[PDB]
Design a protein around this nucleic acid. Sequence first.
DNA 1: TGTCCCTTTGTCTCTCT
DNA 2: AGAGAGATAAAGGGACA
Length: 493
Amino acid sequence: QWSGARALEALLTVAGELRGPPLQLDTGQLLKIAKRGGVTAVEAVHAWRNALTGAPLNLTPEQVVAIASHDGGKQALETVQRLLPVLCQAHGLTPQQVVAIASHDGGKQALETVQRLLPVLCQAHGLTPEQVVAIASHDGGKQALETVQALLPVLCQAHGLTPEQVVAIASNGGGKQALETVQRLLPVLCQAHGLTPQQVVAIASNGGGKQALETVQRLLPVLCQAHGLTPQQVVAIASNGGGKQALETVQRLLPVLCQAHGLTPQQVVAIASNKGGKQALETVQRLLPVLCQAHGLTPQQVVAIASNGGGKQALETVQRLLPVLCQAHGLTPQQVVAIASHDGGKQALETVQRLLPVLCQAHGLTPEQVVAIASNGGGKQALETVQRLLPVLCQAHGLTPEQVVAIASHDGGKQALETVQRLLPVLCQAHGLTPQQVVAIASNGGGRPALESIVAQLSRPDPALAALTNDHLVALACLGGRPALDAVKKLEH
DNA sequence: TGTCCCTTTGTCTCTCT
DNA sequence: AGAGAGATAAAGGGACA
């Protein structure tokens, strides 16, 4: 008999139980824990279900699931019930910060290292607890924290990095490797190739930071001679998430894409310059002719779709959905391209296919409005949030559908919609902003934190901003969101 | 296997002008 | 507004006890 059977059965017995109180998990959550934390994590969740749920710790099931669903999840759960009160009461962290540190493979190691090293990192090395938490909150967090403790001086003094730069490099999975590689390659990349430390930090500050730095060292000469690529272009390919894989793929596919399809090197660099850039390039090589036949999509339109994170996913999804969306839903090919040409284009496209009928029919939006909401990063999230929140926003808060669509139609649309739902009443009733002013603040990228900054100034006024009327603060918030408010405070004093 | 650490890819959100 | 940057996450491999 297949040896995995007894454990699978154990897994399923314990799982079915967790569907009960006090966690009541769903198949999705159960699968998630089983898939990364394994049977051991599922059993640990059950055994610890009562101790995590309410007082003392009072963790939500989502938080329990977030902690359990990683390699060593059982170890992280044990450690969180032990160290959460310590970290909150002895170092002044929030439960949310503790849970963030915990929710990665080896979370136990991260938690224990934060407990051990936070004081020396803050006192002796000058970091804030926020910076320590960010460093800790990735797989290998323990290694990154220990490497920051060891290398912070040499990186700032011998190599000229700011502590902020060191923190940014550390704050990725594989942070220890990136830090060590920067220490070794910074003078090589700067002195031999004329890169600024800023460009080096930009290359290093991503997962696979080590790999991207070594690949830039190895490939920069070859790429900047034989392929007429500029150093700026190579840095961009390396620093945008594509890392080592994107660089090696550009070396392979630049001449193929240029010669065979007439793409420009600028176009190839743009396709390369994202997470999964390698995947995007190879998919363009494969799919451009299939999409561009019959005067179908133009090359330019294909390049636009490809030129985002997950470009490969967007491309393949366009190929799948272009005909059904255009025919069955009446969208233009142009509109499909629009929807597809953002990070997560696949998700947005699939969500439009699914929700365009319902938003139009059940909520009285136009297809144009659905497309407008869909055509931003996180479009899927904004579409599903419009579906959920249109009746409460309109019926209870008095907003028009047009205003809801406008809030929804930016990156972070979901966040802006939820925040308006949350804060409209205190902003309007308690502080006399008009709904129109609230909608104006929220109808930009960064809508949510702009609203929260405003609410904060009205609820605990900082004298630094007290010379501005609500109307002026509203104008400021619309102009430049939370950062503009923060910037103005700095100006005051 | 369980746990830890690293790398790649994909998705979402905010900033910066 | 559209590029750049960072946050959050899934999932696979190396390593080792």
